[PDB]
Amino acid sequence: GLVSACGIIVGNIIGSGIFVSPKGVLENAGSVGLALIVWIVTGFITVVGALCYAELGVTIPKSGGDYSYVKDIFGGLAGFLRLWIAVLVIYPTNQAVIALTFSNYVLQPLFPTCFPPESGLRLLAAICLLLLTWVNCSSVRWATRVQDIFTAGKLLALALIIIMGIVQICKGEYFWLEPKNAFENFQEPDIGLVALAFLQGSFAYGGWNFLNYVTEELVDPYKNLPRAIFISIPLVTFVYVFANVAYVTAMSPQELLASNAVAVTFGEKLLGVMAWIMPISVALSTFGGVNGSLFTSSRLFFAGAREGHLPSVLAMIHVKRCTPIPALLFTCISTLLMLVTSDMYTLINYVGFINYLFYGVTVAGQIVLRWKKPDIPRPIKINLLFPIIYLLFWAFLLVFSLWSEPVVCGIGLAIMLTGVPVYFLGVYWQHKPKCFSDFIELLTLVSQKMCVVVYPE
Template sequence: MEKGARHRNNTEKNYPGGSESQEADSGGGGVALKKEIGLVSACAIIVGNIIGSGIFVSPKGVLENAGSVGLALIIWIVTGVITAVGALCYAELGVTIPKSGGDYSYVKDIFGGLAGFLRLWIAVLVIYPTNQAVIALTFSNYVLQPLFPTCFPPESGLRLLAALCLLLLTWVNCSSVRWATRVQDIFTAGKLLALGLIIIMGVVQICKDFWRETLGGHGLDHAHFCRPVYIWRSQWVPLHLLPCISTLLMLVTSDIYTLINYVGFINYLFYGVTVAGQIVLRWKKPDINRPIKVSLLFPIIYLLFWAFLLVFSLWSEPVVCGIGLAIMVTGVPVYFLGIYWQHKPRCFNKFIELLTLVSQKMCVVVYPKEAEDLKMK
């Protein structure tokens, strides 16, 4: 399927409003995204990815389930140390395999196409939509809670406001990259301000000996609802619609902690697989250039903690974890039918080409021209 509608250098027509590269600069062909993201916006994207909604939601749940402030603090310290260990492992993988794609690129290069496809499959169908649903529900909860001071907001209201938030942000992303970057910048600044207020208020309450009340209250997550903004897409890209629709489906429940457990298990599963790939890569390619090289003790410690959390999650939430695993397994036949099976019948290939061509014409899209200098040599 190297020809026809699937060709990546398809420059059949330039559409107004799209994000196109200047053909004079690219040597006479190809459509690519404009470089419209500046330094501030790029930093805002990084901050938005690092500071998730968990810091605003999790402290209350951790304290409630831990039963004491001391145990909650120990849990936060231990998980912080383990996260730092995992970050060091990812740092080595990032400079050893300098490709865009994160976990997908690492898993695909180390374990093969099936593992990489399953990572991408579960990310598109479960991880990204669930993360966005958690953020949208948290935003709607903190917006509606002041209107219901003596009770919890109605579930229908929470879902409706969350859905409206998602639809609005999807429209912003599909309309203009510049608008999306401005929204990202504004709410990233608001997020940092909210974190600062939480820290300052916490210190003040500690001084007043109201520690328990401080941690038992709500966080300030109103600044974080813009997390679903994918500003690296161009205009007229229908791929905005897939995460939006998938996220709307996740709103069948308004229980934030159920969604967190749901996505946490699957996400952490592939974190462990990626870190295990670091050990495998050390064995398969011991002489590869590694600008950053950490001790093997770090991935081993991380994997031991990873295995404990997976077993505990399966024991405590078997249904939630089982649903995530079932969705992941559905990607296996898709991979073998769509990618691994090379010698497909001609009628099958013609149907896929026709379907792709019709989709491209309806959505006004083509494949972007790949930048050669970004490919791994």
């Protein structure tokens, strides 16, 4: 209907991004008055971005997502890079961060005032990964009956923060870090650090670049969908902006930049029945972000192996218990390669930089489609005031995050330059010596012997 199609936009934008973002959007924003503006601005700048993706997704009624939208506007080169980055970086490091915030929420009740053993962290993300792969490589009915208990884990963690913040404002004070008595801006930021807050405050808002076109094909609400995303995303900013309020009414910001696991120190500085409720029901929530982002990747292998690329060794199906066994192993191997980093907040900046590289190009593709080739039958048409303020918000968010730390954002522009030699020999090559083609024939067929998978019909 309308509310149940509003509930499956709030019910999945909420995730495990709120449990590691307030340690990151507070250090780079300097103070707490500027760290609540960033939680307000990026909620508003995304309803610009979600109103825009509804427009391109209704005049090009295709399936697959953003990979289907660059190919119909830009060339064959720029369309392929969206499939090629989202299978190499943005999926293997949207589950290398939600696996690393599982280890930090299980060691922190044991190592409170000492930073944990660093080489014992990675052996707790290579157990959350390798158990959730084998569960997702078994029958697909197992991959949903436990998913809706990792909503029950996430919701009990977030309803307990949303209630204990109501008590602390009725039993304690009113707005303790307000600009009348308290709240000095003692470390005032500038050009570089105030833009690095929008790259960690936009990790908790993932889940709309594909997660709105899977809504209209169940009940068909008939173009109430832009009216269904004006009451959804302010219902997810008000939950997000009141949880960060409920942290600073229970601890100091000298401590919120000290602790590695944010929700477990808030959990222990309030209540006497601890360590079976707060670090339990967050480690149950980051299981449903490493499970829900593995079988999300399966619908990119399928739609990627249709047009020209992502060859037929991938996108196969187990003959019984139909699950893509040689496709899930491509992310599960490439995630464990991305666990060699000595931090986590330098992987949130690595994802969010190139995640905004494609949130600007596929919105600038609208302006080209609005200028070149106009007059298409369009059900829902939006103002031009909206996609021009995104193009300037995307403008100063990349030139300011490149002038600061040009190494983690300096290889995000170096992966996408490897694809230009890759899109020189995939479908752009003459088969005269016939030597290299038959090896591609070889490892494809023996993989059908190693696992029993076949092609779909």
